[PDB]
Design a protein around this ligand. Structure first.
Ligand SMILES: [Zn+2]
Ligand SMILES: [Zn+2]
Ligand SMILES: [Zn+2]
Length: 210
């Protein structure tokens, strides 16, 4: 007992769905001693070692330990195809090296439906109105939701964490809040929903206007 632990994190959902972008797997080593700061990383893709990993300069934590992070770029298709990413961590503080493995959630991809809603009758008596965008029937839970007004990014939104449904699929909600006037003056609002099961990972949704 004692000595370093390793934790392994998947890429960011949006990074996995936009081929334009660079998905990364991230290996984090904590409880590295002040004595043996140095950490070697070995990465594997379905068991075969890869060398493109970038290790970040180690960082001193307040509890008198070092934290060391290695970041492995992965290919759009490899990650989505369930390739297996292993992070092996060697330190003089460990008798023998430590492994973790991650891949995408196992299972049968399901395309979501997106339902868009103007504000409820009871909301239309308020200074501020909400525009709701409901996503249900997606598997896995990896997804990206975003809002534009007249193709410009809109930032006053909140998106629930996907919730598991009865049939195994996931459901979530996204709400964008704007001045009643902006809605009434007839501006257009778009929910942008990306999921792997959607064709080109671009889900179709109807824009909202009065
Ligand atoms: Zn080699
Ligand atoms: Zn793709
Ligand atoms: Zn389809």
């Amino acid at each position: 007992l004692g000595g370093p632990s390793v934790f392994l994190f998947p890429p960011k959902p949006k990074d996995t769905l936009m081929i334009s972008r660079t998905p990364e797997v991230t290996c984090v080593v904590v409880d590295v001693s002040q004595e043996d700061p140095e950490v070697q990383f070995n990465w594997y893709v379905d068991g075969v070692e890869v060398h493109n990993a970038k290790t970040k300069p180690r960082e001193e934590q307040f509890n008198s330990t070092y934290r060391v992070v290695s970041v492995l770029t992965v290919l759009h298709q490899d990650w989505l195809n369930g390739k297996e990413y292993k992070c092996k961590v060697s330190n003089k503080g460990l008798p023998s090296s430590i492994e973790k493995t991650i891949s995408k959630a196992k299972g049968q991809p399901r395309e979501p439906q997106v339902y868009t809603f103007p504000p409820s009758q009871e909301e239309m008596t308020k200074n501020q109105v909400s525009l709701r965008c409901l996503v249900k029937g997606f598997y896995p839970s990896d997804i990206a939701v975003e809002w534009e007004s007249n193709g410009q990014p809109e930032n006053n939104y909140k998106t629930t964490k996907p919730v598991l449904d009865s049939d195994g699929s996931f459901r979530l909600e996204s709400r964008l809040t704007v001045d009643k006037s902006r809605w009434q003056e007839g501006n257009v609002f778009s929910c942008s929903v990306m999921h792997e099961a959607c064709s080109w990972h671009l889900c179709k949704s109807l824009s909202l206007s009065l």
